[model samples]
Target: GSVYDAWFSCASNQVAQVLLTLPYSFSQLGMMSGILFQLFYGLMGSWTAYLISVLYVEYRTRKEREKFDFRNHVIQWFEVLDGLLGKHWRNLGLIFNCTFLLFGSVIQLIACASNIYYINDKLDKRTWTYIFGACCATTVFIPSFHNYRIWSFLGLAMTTYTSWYLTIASLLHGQAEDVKHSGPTTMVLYFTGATNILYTFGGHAVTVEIMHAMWKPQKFKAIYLLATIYVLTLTLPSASAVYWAFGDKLLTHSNALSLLPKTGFRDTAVILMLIHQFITFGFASTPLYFVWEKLIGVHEMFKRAMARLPVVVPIWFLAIIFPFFGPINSAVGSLLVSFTVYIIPALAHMLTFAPAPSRENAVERPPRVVGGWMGTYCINIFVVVWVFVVGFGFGGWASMVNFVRQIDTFGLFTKCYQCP
Candidate 1:
């Protein structure tokens, strides 16, 4: 894959439905904190993505030059941990990956159903959800990561249109009542919002997978950097504009499209988002289908479709039961996403690049961070601490509290278009 293809893959993966909640995150954290979180997390995500690419190149180069056993050749993210850390870490990574895929698919289902229901509520969200779930399950027929480039292009185009459209719509609406002075009321809400902000930068979970498909994997450094910037340009301006327009009102309607007055404009945006969300659902769930096929030993196309049922059935059941996207998003972001995105990459990079003894009887050492060992370790050390302390500890508690509160508010297995 060319760098441009890799770039589009990263962009399409990131410029997704999760961004629709940025206004709500901003409502909870207010302007200054929200924007700062977006900017900081965006940069940190780039760093982690860059580190993953660097490590891939490091190990691949080692395998070629030193004639070391590259067993899996780092095709999956877990393989990196498995090769460098151990088998246990690889096992743990597998568990995390499955959970990420399941939760991600569920979230995408909720997003799709919510948007389609927004456009036309002739069907209840539960019914629309099952319809979309059925549609997404058909993606099992798509067998190769190398072929996602076209989907990426189409997905990115849809997102660009919706993001800019939303931004302009929000600007035309002007500021709402109390928007000038509105801010979050409680620490729990703010921390929950912080986690949601982190969610915006969460494609790192799939970074290695993207890099593996690249013809020039080393150029993944440039790919992620450009993708992050492109995503921010599409996501942040609209999120900021929507927050500016709605402010405290966003607490109840986190999906910014709901805030727009009924018009062809809103309907068109919703329709576009619906299509984009389905594409995204397919993308997120595709990884798990591949894993399931491998486990089921399915080589035939029909067998692959049947293999996916095990993964999709449970996801559909869960989505039907609990379609609360906001709470689930923050909770998953705090607990799983923080670890996968921030903690794992930093830890892996440190272990891989540490100024320690070279491997036993190696022809040459693996790639090292240029400059000094002091700076690399210190920076990654801070990343580990910050993610654990701020993201996991504080944000985790906040998410659980908010989730319970939301359960009390909306309950389960109901049409919950409104929120706190």
Candidate 2:
């Protein structure tokens, strides 16, 4: 598969566990609306992914040209953008990417802790929070997964199983009568949720790395297409199914997992979910892992393991201080995912490429469907200014507002057992 493990890798992490359906924030979508919203999101997200694939092709094409050098060297995702979008965008991308990863790691810590805490509401959730981030730093460490492929496969099974299990679990009728459907009247609730959609579906950040793993990069389109479609199909059902089933009964949580009752079924799902955090944790903390390993030689005893702490420590600290998972997902998704998924891609296409080349030396390019509207010289400009610019602020601000307001009730590290 040209899409490689990263397809599953990103898909593995895309579920908006908190922001999509948190108690305080955007809650879950309704029967018709949630499903439709996700479908539309997948469609748009896949198109963006397709655009990203084409960018890689453009980069490769440029390598053949005489104007630039480094024909033999393989370019990374940022490098591709660096050449096309220039230095400032590239630097900003680095900043956003790091933050995005950090956000993801923190969310994962909170998510994992919250679910397990639900199994034993009396136990402090922050205890597990420390384990996922703080404790992982000092006690457990894996320099690199030996047979990394095996670990990924296990992770795939772990996450996918959790999704399927939860989907079916929602249909279970015996849980309770109260938390059955979504809120009666809800607005601006989903603006924050939109960022969750953006974050979940935006995997183009690792698109180049995925394509590089393939023997024939030419098949990238098919691979990206299949992966995007597959993930979209899986995500909507999992999120919407539960949302549709228990919209009314659900209340705020450490996460959506808490929405389900404490049963044998939920306990199994919790175990599966906890397994997911371990595997998925690598995806978010990967940047720091690389940096730390480089700074402190990978060969040093316990070097690979210890270096991971620099990234995990901060995430642990954040999760401890701000225990709410949904708001954090919205805040991070709105800002970081917005720039990476929407703004960066739009800017790159508008600045670097044109629908039709005006002059010679353009014949080598492959054809693509271009321009969204008539008289549209640069559609991406409209996308950046209109869609993401407005959308990002809306989602980020709304989530932040809700979070600040709720803080009086929930102010960090305190036990949320039988939490009101």
Candidate 3:
């Protein structure tokens, strides 16, 4: 049953969608802001909202006993917008989503390339860049015309290997050593939690799509519980361990797990994890290829050329020149795109479609159900607090302003290659 669950759930989990968020989790908020930020911003509010949203959606489906269809829901949402603002708004949403994916994908591609170069110190940067580019082109481009099941499988394998290696590294290196660093104020912590909550809940756009892919909607609760537990088991402990062992010194790269000295099994695990990362990065880039093709009209004019060359070349170029800049570029880019494009749309949808109905004057107000009263209020409070924290307190606003101000000096196109 576990294997069966793993197989099906892995396919449906859309692991790449979540994995893409890892750099931000480990680097931006987790390491940069330190454990205090993680506890309040990441764990308390953001992760909590994520759980609540998943449960809430499940509850809605259970009450209605409705069958879920992913494509239908997407089309329906588009239709709702079309009704309100005509075809232009619908197209705009599509364009925004695609653009977010494209930009985010490029950032990740560059990060992945950098990761490879870091490991292979002997390789010339230009050669490695071209090599990475060629590999991406072949694996992602060629497969675009085929089914995406392979990508799902590749994602699961990558997650498994990465998790295994990280666990070993944590054990060997000892929990990340604690070091004194300036922590956020209590008020900042509260607001950070709020933003993380909104961002996490908003990510359910992809979650809903994954849920629809499942064979039995009735088992959704079980799947959700299992996935949540699995992620928490790996994530929370890893976060705690790294914080405990290295404290403020924790590396921003996701492959920090590989930084520990190799010892037999640990060494083997590291190699496997590297292979896994390569595959995972390749898989993540596929959608970007599609996005570029669609955006540039390459898919219409020269579908094969778009698939084979455009996808591979740019990614490889980034991998070669940008590896040393570390992982911050990818992390920040993802955060901006994810919050601006994906999470914002979901928040707007929830506000528009699922607003709490007004409570009118009544002779005897019915006893408040736990489902509707305290729960909703708590979620709302948490979301508000989180948005403020992430937007204002956690230095996200500062980071954004600084990033924008230095865009020209920092070079947006090559920020991943050499950031100041």
Candidate 4:
């Protein structure tokens, strides 16, 4: 019973995280990555590897029961140095994570608001920003006080719209010829493939939370499988198709869905999809904001003040300004998430749960153990090679350092450095 609860909770949280990330994947990585490289390497290969890894992890960990302590897990794993260092480490981790989360959320919020403003044109950007912000704040604040069950329903509805929109875009437009011609470098293709895998699997931290909320272990597996298949089916192909059609024309920072020509049904569909996404953005950002606020002591003292301002203000600012900086922010964000959230945690689990030499001898290991030494080793090698090739292959160490510095700076600004 306890184990089931943990699994369900974790799974649910993973679902939320996946939904939030899908847009970024579709817009930033899917379009540009696909165009730069071929779909086989950029989308299919990466997704195949990711799916296999996820299945292997589940199979290997199936027998091991999970514990359902959200706070403890959060403190230990999610909070950067908390598990290894101390309370101070946890505090610092919280600050950093919150800052990153806020920065990312704000950017998405801004994108959503700006997109709406562009469509309507009747309202000024600031007006739409405030309006969206107010709506976001209310949705987030109200749910904290109430059942909050509606968000899940909203999620389901939005997922449907997203699926539909992507399907239409893929079928109608096909792959863009331009992107196909300006192919990505070999190294970029490999890194893009690897990062996409990381995004799919590693970005499921929240889903793990949801899985932990369930009541039965058997139920956990069933729900997890269903959700995984559903998400992949909808997301993977559409992303590939978009890459096929648009190739390099796909904008790196904005949602690729925005790239669809705004005419007739496609236009109307895009608007509907955006509205649904905006609501979802509110749902995603509110809880994250609340959690961060509590960690920083702001929730207790200035909770009401913050809540009153609405969630959309910061989001609008990010969407409008960040994209102008080019795809750097988006790329860096994806890389950070791929490394820290997805790949790192998976590696940690593999290390911690590695079979002892004696155990390995006692039970003849399967030739194909998932998340076992072989799988972990493969992933480690892939990541190392990817980093070496993508990080350094372009311009050697100098380019690698420059890329890292850019991301690091972005992280620092999003963490403690204030935006002017």
Query: lDDT (CA) for every model shown?
Result: 0.78, 0.60, 0.43, 0.44
Cα lDDT tens digits for candidate 4, 16-66: 223323443444344455334332222322332343233333432432335
Candidate ranking (lDDT, best to worst) = 1, 2, 4, 3
**Model 1 whole-model lDDT (C-alpha atoms):** 0.78
* Per-model tally of clashing residue pairs: 1, 12, 20, 43
lDDT of 3 by residue, 1-420 (tens): 233443344333333323323322443344544334333433332333333234334334433455544333322233334443347765764555544444444444444554454456575445555665566565653544123455455555556555555555666677433543333334333233223322322332333333444455444434554554554444445545544444334333334533445456554544554455455454444445555665676653244655546555555554443443323333333355344324444344344334344222111222255354346445555554545454434535544443454454545444234311
Give the runs in model 2 whose Cα sits over 4 Å from its true position.
Answer: 1-7, 16-28, 60-75, 120-122, 138-147, 174-186, 291-308, 354-382, 417-420
Q: What's each prediction's TM-score?
A: 0.92, 0.82, 0.62, 0.61
What global local distance difference test value does model 2 have?
0.60
Select the stronger candidate by lDDT from 2 and 3: 2
- Candidate 1, residues 1-420, lDDT tens digits: the string is 778888988998885777788888888998888889988888888877877676666656665776776464336777667776678878877777778777878888888887787777778888888888888777767765455577888888888988988899999989866565367789898998899988778563888878887877877877788899999888789988998888788887768777788788788788878888787777777777776766677733665566668888888888878787677788888888888878877887787655455433333333366334566667778888988998999999999898888788778887654632
Order of candidate numbers by TM-score, starting with the best: 1, 2, 3, 4
Q: Candidate 1 at 205: error in angstroms?
A: 1.0
The parts of candidate 4 lying over 4 Å away from their true place are 1-96, 122-127, 143-150, 173-181, 185-201, 217-226, 243-248, 251-264, 296-317, 323-329, 350-368, 371-420
Question: TM-score of predicted model 4?
Answer: 0.61
By summed lDDT, which 10 consecutive residues of candidate 1 come out lowest?
358-367
